[PDB]
Paper text:
[name] (GAPDH) is a highly conserved enzyme involved in the ubiquitous process of glycolysis and presents a loop (residues 208–215 of [name] GAPDH) in two alternative conformations (I and II). In the presence of inorganic phosphate (Pi), GAPDH catalyzes the conversion of D-glyceraldehyde-3-phosphate (G3P) to 1,3-diphosphoglycerate ([name]), accompanying the reduction of NAD+ to NADH. All the structures reported in this paper have four subunits: O, P, Q, and R. Each subunit contained two domains: the C-terminal catalytic domain and the N-terminal NAD+-binding domain. Two anion recognition sites, “Ps” and “Pi”, bind the C3 phosphate of G3P and inorganic phosphate, respectively.
The structure of ternary complexes [name].NAD.[name] and C150S.NAD.NPG provides further information on the driving force behind the phosphorylation step and the mechanism of the nucleophilic attack of inorganic phosphate on the carbonyl group of the thioacyl intermediate to generate [name]. In addition, the O subunit of C150S.NAD.[name] and the P subunit of [name].NAD.[name] contain an unexpectedly large electron-dense cluster near the active site and NAD+, which was attributed to the product [name]. [name] in C150S.NAD.[name] and [name].NAD.[name] holds refined occupancy factors of 0.85 and 0.8, respectively. Upon the superimposition of the ternary complexes C150S.NAD.[name] and [name].NAD.[name] with their corresponding binary complexes, the RMSD values are 0.104 (1197 atoms) and 0.168 Å (1235 atoms), respectively. These results indicate that the overall structures of [name].NAD.[name] and C150S.NAD.[name] are like those of its binary complex, except for the presence of the product. The oxygen atom of O5P of C3 phosphate forms hydrogen bonds with NH1 of Arg232 and with Oγ of Thr182 and Thr180. O6P and O7P form hydrogens with 2′-OH of NAD+ ribose and Oγ of Thr182 and water, respectively.
Author numbering:
A (entry chain P), B (entry chain Q), D (entry chain R): 1 to 333
C (entry chain O): 0 to 333
């Protein structure tokens, strides 16, 4: 099964298609479901405020997109159980709407004729993959799987390296993160998340994330040992994650940095920098996470030591490269 | 005096209450309708990203707001015909949702028991008031009235002065305008306006407006003589309108400026500046429009002459002061 | 008491110094301003403020002065402090807000220029350094040059002080997510030798050094050498927030931390408390130097290993300025 | 000639090198003058907030950059007199500091041993080239020439087409333009220009431009016929120019757009779109100007007619592609 459907052709959904074409994947996107017309989806695919013009041709008909010459059916079923995935034989659904982030909810795609679902977000207690951290846990019998959040994909490679090298006894994370579509343009009701109701490009906005709390799904030894949250700020994409840890060994910054560099060597998912980059430098990254050695900080008083480690991440395209790596392996199991 | 209900407690709707309290109006707001809980409306009223903390105490119960110790009923009826306006005696509805911009749609407020409706937007061919341009056309028989857009309230006072002093033969308008809630935070579907789908805080976005086309409802002699559009840009509020005119007589810049100054003298609605201000200086303006003599430009070749005149406006609060001026007169009639 | 003040550096901080003094109807009179420009330009900037809106009093100017609320203020343009003619109008205390005299050696030039005392709006080495309502009782009559530290210090210190007093801080690290300022760059281009400072401030998250934690012992001596930290500069015009992750000297709950901080902010004009779901624009114009936010408190514990994260907002412009003015009013009366 | 020096390695200066390399030009940049260290110039060349990572390897020594394996000398002479252009053999100086915008000032580069100078800004009464409008006026005896402003390179192509097809009797433009390094990050003195003292990313800021006033240097028949200004707004690059004209014939929108279409066909400098683009879609443009037929507007009242035509431009990269076109030709004469 190499035929894929995308549910939710938004920021993540459209970049999923862009990245599959970019790596010349064998995967075949045969169908897209969203809430709108092919005309609007085509316009959005062609013109991207964060990544510029689509590198391939885009046209549309009344019920399809034509992308690089190839027809993709377009459906508009707001309930996944009604998506006609069998018409073009979509077997794996990349679930990118945010409305089906649980096993019970994404089961609808299987009731609708698909064989497997890969959810682009945390989805409770199910197989949750950060590629090149725990993708070896994926199994031929898995049918509904999560890639967690962009934040998880940033935190986990760094926490895995520190865990393997030094032990993490306890830690807390703050990500300073680009705003996303769950926020608001102008002050106004946004469900029941009050902070989410506030103008996102005009505020620093505290925001919850399960990235640290649910880390045990990805690194079971760290289960319950991490907590964290986000500060959403006015950049359009490109984010950074700080982890403050008590480690299991006394370290120097050079030692921490060296251990991280070894973990990023020959690692297509986890990059390393000792350059003085800022967030816009991460936009377009092909890594899920880029550890920044320039921000490593060891605070020591007598016997006590706090270790701050920092990694950048393009919460859109970078995370998407991780989603695709996982999808390619998923599709072959 | 009259009791008011507010439909749509959004950017404009909340500022309606703020301005009414600020001027210590005789009008009592007795009921609000929206789509959310009193808790969420209280949070949004108390904390404003553009105008700061609410100047009065704010609390809520399960079915009301308490503002400066006064109770305001809160309803959540998506359909205006279902709002119980009679329960608290709301006589005049300030219609601020965007979903009732016609005589026929806003009739549902009269069906539901109100006497009059003031619509905070263009609403087709009905009486359409820019205070201190044509508010004298209101009379005791009017029951559904429009104050047009923020753009009309910025265009009309300037166009009326030029018309009165020099005549306008033909003109075109461009407003460089703050983004608003009809736009998108991230690239995504926004109805059928393609350009409205693009990230508003990250782009210059061309945007249609009816202010020029429908100016004849406010200034009858200018019917058919003006066109225009908007460029929406990344400022949160505060806007400016340029009008390029062929006038009915030859003029100098000083002459235009003196004529506008006379038109703004003792004019609570229409301000004048010859200071080198920028958009943030108009935020919180108590004028619907402020003419800027520093940007007047006369381009002339032979007997041909283009006149560019420029006025600032706080599309949120400044417009609201005009809406309240009109509401205050509407209620006395 | 000393009542006549001069401002050196009529910038973001210096202009708000005047605004706040008029706001609180201080007996302190600003009689002179020094900067590098014309009265016309200084009057333009005082009248029109992108962050706080129109000046609340009238503003006019002459060729050598500003006229503010009807009161004349002399304007000088001496790039070297030693040349400022402070004695013409009798300016006694200089509020030093240029960023170019951030040491005792540098700022004593104002004394050479005829002033009696200097209050520096920034860290200024190992001199007497005051965070009001943390350690202002250490000011005495012999202090002649004083620092109020940074906006970050005025945010970090009240929170750390309450933690220190209640539970002990054995070690900690701070990250402030902070509004950009004029030390950064509008477009990518050289900005001295800080590489990251060269990058477009309104288009990036930009890591940025601060001394607030490293030098906290000037304000809370028992924490000397126990804290580190840095900043992430982000695209908001003003309004900032500081997170502190601490190992405390006691096992705690979140309610227990929040209650201690609440007690420390009670009857405290410098240090506020909130349990509302606010965002940065809600702190713009704060009359506090720091506002502890109980909704962000987080206790992470594994056995006897405990990390405590406490968070406080601050308006790095106006809120800091209110602390500067508090210290100035006390300074002038010693 | 084939050996270039760059004075002012800023936004334009760095992009000049980027573009020369992108088009595999035979011109080689042999030296750079600025005010800083090779390390900082290397950092800035490698990491670009608007265009992302440099596509070629960058490194430095104490006195040079190494770009794609080639060494480039780096000087830091505040005064062009002192730049040893001689040493490395720098024949043509691309003058991008803003501080030598006259034939008299750029004389210094010739005194220091350069043979020609191309100034990246208006520089008074000298040959001023918009490529594919008037680059044929260049001859082998030219030593110091200007490529005008980004605004001129946007206005001139559109004006030229209209003038050729219809005649422009008089007109005025407004560009809604990305903020640049001449503006302020926070409110504070910026020389004598009051509006330039204001926070550029938080404001709409009126701003003077000479593009229209000086158009006669590029289109001599339009001398003294145009005026205009700018509104600088909070986007980092990517701008748009509106021109309101009285034409010499009556026209329809379709007729205007087909005239512009024809003038842009096989026109490598001047592009055409009828797609609903927004400013970020122009970032990275390889045109000096892109005419947008979706924004054409004809306001007609009897014999009078105002024609609004609109063209997009990447004021950084797009303008640079025009500068390089002119340079390549300038170098061969
Ligand atoms: N933006 C990020 O940085 C990021 C990173 C990683 C993961 N994610 C997660 O991926 C998912 C999508 O994120 P996004 O930023 O692309 O959101 P988005 O709002 O840009 O896209 C959501 C798409 O789903 C469509 N949609 C909504 N409900 C639908 C429904 N019932 N049926 C079909 N289509 C529907 C919408 O029209 C839209 O196109 C979320 O779960 C998000 O948490 C986001
Ligand atoms: N610059 C401005 O924002 C501005 C200026 C002048 C006029 N207007 C016009 O005023 C009106 C509101 O504009 P806004 O910026 O305040 O928009 P908004 O989106 O901020 O507020 C709209 C409010 O109405 C609520 N709402 C939506 N549908 C509803 C319904 N069926 N019933 C009850 N409540 C509903 C929404 O929850 C929201 O609180 C529009 O007509 C707008 O064109 C806006
Ligand atoms: N902006 C903040 O958030 C903040 C908060 C607390 C403390 N501070 C500190 O306050 C001081 C001022 O900061 P700011 O943001 O107001 O900077 P600013 O750049 O806005 O103001 C500096 C002012 O001083 C002028 N100036 C520069 N050199 C001068 C000289 N030799 N003589 C006279 N005037 C000169 C400048 O023209 C300008 O008006 C700095 O030390 C800063 O670290 C800033
Ligand atoms: N930014 C635009 O959109 C744009 C477009 C077209 C033309 N221009 C013009 O091109 C020129 C450069 O504009 P920019 O945006 O790149 O400015 P910039 O501020 O980004 O770059 C100017 C460079 O020149 C350096 N410099 C300043 N003075 C110098 C000196 N005496 N000697 C050597 N180096 C010096 C600076 O360090 C800086 O690196 C200006 O004349 C501008 O009007 C700008
Ligand atoms: O990022 C998130 O991930 P989780 O909250 O952990 O599910 C969300 O908080 C909201 O933003 P997003 O869904 O676009 O990523
Ligand atoms: O829903 C959001 C508002 O309607 C925005 O106002 P607007 O109509 O002026 O764009
Ligand atoms: O605080 C650190 C740096 O000095 C930059 O910020 P500033 O404007 O407060 O001086
Ligand atoms: O140095 C820069 C020039 O003086 C101004 O040109 P600019 O405003 O278009 O960038
Ligand atoms: Cl958590
Ligand atoms: Cl129109
Ligand atoms: Cl000195
Ligand atoms: Cl430190
Ligand atoms: Cl002009």
């Amino acid at each position: 099964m190499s035929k894929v459907g995308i549910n939710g052709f938004g920021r993540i959904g459209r970049l999923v298609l862009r990245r599959l074409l970019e790596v010349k994947s064998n995967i075949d996107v045969v169908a897209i479901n969203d809430l709108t017309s092919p005309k609007i989806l085509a316009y959005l695919l062609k013109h991207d405020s964060n990544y510029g013009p689509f590198p391939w041709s885009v046209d549309f008909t009344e019920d399809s997109l034509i992308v690089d010459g190839k027809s993709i059916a377009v459906y508009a079923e707001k309930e996944a159980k009604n998506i006609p995935w069998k018409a073009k034989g979509a077997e794996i659904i990349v679930e990118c709407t945010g409305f089906y982030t649980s096993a019970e909810k994404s089961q609808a795609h299987l009731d609708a004729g698909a064989k497997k679902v890969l959810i682009s977000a945390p989805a409770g207690e199910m197989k949750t993959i950060v590629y090149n951290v725990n993708d070896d846990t994926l199994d031929g019998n898995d049918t509904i799987v999560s890639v967690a959040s962009c934040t998880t994909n940033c935190l986990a490679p760094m926490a895995k390296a520190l865990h393997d090298s030094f032990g993490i006894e306890v830690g807390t994370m703050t990500t300073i993160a680009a705003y996303t579509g769950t926020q608001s343009l102008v002050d106004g009701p946004r469900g029941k998340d009050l902070r989410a109701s506030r103008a996102a490009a005009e505020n620093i906005i505290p925001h919850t994330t399960g990235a640290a709390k649910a880390i045990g799904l990805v690194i079971p030894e760290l289960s319950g040992k991490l907590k964290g949250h986000a500060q959403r700020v006015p950049v359009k994409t490109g984010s950074v994650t700080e982890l403050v840890s008590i480690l299991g060994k006394k370290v120097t910054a050079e030692e921490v940095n060296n251990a991280l560099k070894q973990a990023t060597t020959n690692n297509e998912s986890f990059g390393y920098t000792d350059e003085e980059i800022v967030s816009s430098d991460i936009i377009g990254s092909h890594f899920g996470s880029v550890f920044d050695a320039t921000q490593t900080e060891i605070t020591a008083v007598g016997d006590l030591q706090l270790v701050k480690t920092v990694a950048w991440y393009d919460n859109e395209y970078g995370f998407v490269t991780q989603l695709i790596r996982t999808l390619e392996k998923f599709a072959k199991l």
